[PDB]
Design a binder for these strands. Structure first.
Lengths: 151, 100, 206, 50
RNA sequence: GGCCGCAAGGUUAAAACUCAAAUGAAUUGACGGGGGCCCGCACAAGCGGUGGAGCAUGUGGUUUAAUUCGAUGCAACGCGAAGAACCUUACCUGGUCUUGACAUCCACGGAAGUUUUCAGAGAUGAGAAUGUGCCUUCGGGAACCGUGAGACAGGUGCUGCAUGGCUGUCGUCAGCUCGUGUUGUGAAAUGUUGGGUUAAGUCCCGCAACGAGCGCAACCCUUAUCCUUUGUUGCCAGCGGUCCGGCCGGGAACUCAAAGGAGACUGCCAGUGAUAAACUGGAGGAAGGUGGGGAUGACGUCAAGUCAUCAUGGCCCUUACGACCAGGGCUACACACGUGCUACAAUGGCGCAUACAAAGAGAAGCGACCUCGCGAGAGCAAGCGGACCUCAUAAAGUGCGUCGUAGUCCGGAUUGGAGUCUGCAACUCGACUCCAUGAAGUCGGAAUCGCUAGUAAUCGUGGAUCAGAAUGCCACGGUGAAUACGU
């Protein structure tokens, strides 16, 4: 806004584990105010992912996120009558938010049967450095690299 | 509203008040089960000879000060415009502007 | 823009109602109609006695009417004959026993209805509207109102193009809900059409 | 609130009805007669059940 | 025409005809692809939609005997209509009346229940019964019916560019003005500009100004925390009966009902700032700096809307532009646009069984228990003018099964048969139920809309109008996000 200071809203932690990251992930997955459905889907997905890797659900989740977090991006400027792409850094909260959004968006487009299966497959591919989310990170970094002259 | 429409309404109310009992009796005959199966036919043929304006469904509610056929309220017997004028003057007990 | 009705917005805060009775859904409308007819009759019959308010009450199975006036002698008459005639006609209209009471207005120059009526009467006899308005304002301020406003609208003086004019003295705070503001209106019927009049009088905060 | 087309621009009104109940347990003839022979303000409705 | 010049041209220098103005310097505004400062879902950061399909509903056009009249960039198009089968109705076709369907006056005779023939009906005729009350000093005729004649009635006929009243919009924007004094020949100016600050012409300081008014804020309603009064139709920690249930004796504690009160003021603490106004942070507190939401609309602008709510100057028609009646139309259909509902599916469809609400309405009304019918419903009949009875069973949710990516166990337009109910009467033109049928459609081109929090999105429930007839309008609660670096 123009003359405002916006505080932070309090977010409850997860009921099974105790993380706020997982709560934010549930929130980004939910549709139409149906939180129980999203919780069920996420718990099923994490359960199926833990067996494929023999490590804890939280550790697998963090491993998946660390390969999707971005570092730099491009904004649009127009002062000389033309559109320029200006590279900027990304701050941590935005890094996490963008990673989560890209993971869910990639999962929804897959062709497996159930949403839990789609999410599990997408997370495993991300942990191995494959999939549309990782391709998106690559594209963003490429565009930011091709414009370092305007920094 | 024209002066003839109000007269029409007055005539309708008069006839509907005049023929109230005859219609109720004939309709009870027609509706009641285990009748003669011929009295029913005769009552059906008799109900349609009474004047048309004796059916209470030919009546239209009107504002009691202007005769308007739209925007009627039953508690007050008036239309919206006259309701508002009286309310602002203070002529309807208990009524006032509300907020919540 | 458009403005809210002063009396209406002040009902129940600092202003009273003009009718006081309780009824149910099957008598409400009939009672409203009877009140309308009674007020119409009295307003026609006392057109020259300076009436300013007609209050109605319905206790038990009867009607009691209180008339606020500046000429109680002219309303009553010779040993009450006129009041008796009014009582009989009102009882006939209502359909139940009737009672009539009279109250006096001490200062007719501080009453909004009577000021508007006087201006309309003067306008129907071809007086100058500026003179009429100024005289009203001066009289009210002399007798001690904290403020007054007068407004007039129409074909003033016979012009072909209509117009609105107004005058003000003192204070007239219309956004303050505890201000005691008096308000009323009146109409004039001339050879060129209708002319409208509005009056505001301010008397203090409560 | 407009004589012709303006579908917004409404007014909203309210009527409030207040209610109270009183009970008498051990009456006497004089008390009941006194209650029946009484008159109160001219805007209240009173209903008596024996 | 003369003089001068190689030329280009220079110099001296008219008239006819035409217009009622052309011009200089200053003043108040409006505008600028001029400058400076500040605001708003204005952009930016996000979430969900409209534009493509079928259906509902309004408008343009076209057609018709008629498809009644009004609203038109934002500020007309689910708008006047909060409910067109007859009525409503103002339009069309045909049949009828002329002081009249609705009033006040004069004078010639008497009223109100039933019941037969002809009309589509309006409206014509034949018959039976009745003898009202009430100073009858006879004149009462009041109450209410026939005809006759004329002063009159009657008009949703035209002009919102003759008007009153009411309403939209710029805009809940922070502005708009006056008295006395002073400056200028004057139109005008100052005050209202300046340094800070604020949501605010809000506040302080300075200054040829000193003061005041209408607007801003406050007083009104609702929501969040306490306590003192009264406890049925509302309520059960402690006590005791048991057929298990607030059922019963009881109790006045609690939830709740509704009247009186208490509380929030930058009041307290530190830092900044002009020895200020204010600002950033902290304590205690249910709540903190306008705690959240409503009502409240300045001087004025658009010859803005309404003579069809009503009232009203001036025109216009009176065996007709005024009454009465039956049938039809306002629902048409090659086409173009606005506002909505239902979908295109596994965060789902279908079967079984199981938690948790708020706010309303009801006597020509709301209609329990029981019986009959697959069902819409029907029969017989308690209770309630209601914290007691009824409408009335919340849904999304949760548990267990099946369907396995197909135009399908997705979607439910159209069309055939058989019925129910309201109402004199459902052909044109109502709502609903059963069996059968099973269309377009796989996420929508250029455009374009809403929303900053208990909001958007999604799920159900009630009312006004109303014999019957909501996917519209006005209210109520359940679950419950994403994002705001910045101008």
């Amino acid at each position: 806004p123009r003359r405002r200071v916006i505080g932070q809203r309090k977010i409850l932690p997860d009921p099974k584990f105790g993380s706020e990251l997982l709560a934010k992930f549930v929130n980004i997955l939910m549709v139409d105010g149906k939180k129980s459905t999203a919780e069920s889907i996420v718990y099923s997905a994490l359960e199926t992912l833990a067996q494929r890797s023999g490590k804890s659900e939280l550790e697998a989740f963090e491993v998946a996120l660390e390969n999707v977090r971005p570092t730099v991006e491009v904004k649009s400027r127009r002062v000389g009558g033309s559109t320029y792409q200006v590279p900027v850094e990304v701050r941590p909260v935005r890094r996490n938010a963008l990673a989560m959004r890209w993971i869910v968006e990639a999962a929804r487009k897959r062709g497996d049967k159930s949403m839990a299966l789609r999410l599990a497959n997408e997370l495993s591919d991300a942990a191995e450095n494959k999939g549309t989310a990782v391709k998106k990170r690559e594209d963003v970094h490429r565009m930011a690299e091709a414009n370092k002259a305007f920094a | 509203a024209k002066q003839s429409m109000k007269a029409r309404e007055v005539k309708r109310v008069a006839l509907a008040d005049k023929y109230f009992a005859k219609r109720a009796e004939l309709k009870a005959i027609i509706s009641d089960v285990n009748a003669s199966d011929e009295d029913r036919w005769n009552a059906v043929l008799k109900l349609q000879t009474l004047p048309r304006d004796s059916s209470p469904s030919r009546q239209r509610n009107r504002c009691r000060q202007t005769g308007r056929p739209h925007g009627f309220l039953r508690k007050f017997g008036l239309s919206r415009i006259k309701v508002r004028e009286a309310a602002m003057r203070g002529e309807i007990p208990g009524l006032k502007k509300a907020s919540w | 823009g458009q403005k809210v009705h002063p009396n209406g917005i002040r009902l129940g805060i600092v202003k009273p109602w003009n009718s006081t009775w309780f009824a149910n859904t099957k008598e409400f409308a009939d009672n409203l109609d009877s009140d309308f007819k009674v007020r119409q009759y009295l307003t026609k019959e006392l057109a020259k006695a300076s009436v300013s308010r007609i209050v109605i009450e319905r206790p038990a199975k009867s009607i009691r009417v209180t008339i606020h006036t500046a000429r109680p002698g002219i309303v009553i008459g010779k040993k009450g004959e006129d009041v008796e005639k009014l009582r009989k006609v009102v009882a006939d209209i209502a359909g139940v026993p009737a009672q009539i009471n009279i109250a006096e207005v001490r200062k007719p120059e501080l009453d909004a209805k009577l000021v508007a009526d006087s201006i309309t009467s003067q306008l129907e006899r071809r007086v100058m509207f500026r003179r009429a308005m100024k005289r009203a304002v001066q009289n009210a301020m002399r007798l001690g109102a904290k403020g007054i406003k007068v407004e007039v609208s129409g074909r003033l003086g016979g012009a072909e193009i209509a117009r609105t004019e107004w005058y003000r003295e003192g204070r007239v705070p219309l956004h303050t809900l505890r201000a005691d503001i008096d308000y009323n209106t009146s109409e004039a019927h001339t050879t060129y059409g209708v002319i409208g009049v509005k009056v505001w009088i301010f008397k203090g905060e409560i | 609130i407009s004589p012709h087309v303006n579908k917004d621009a409404r007014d909203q009104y309210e009527i409030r009805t207040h209610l109270r109940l009183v009970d008498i347990v051990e009456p006497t003839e004089k008390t009941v007669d006194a209650l029946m022979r009484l008159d109160l303000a001219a805007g209240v409705d009173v209903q008596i059940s024996l």
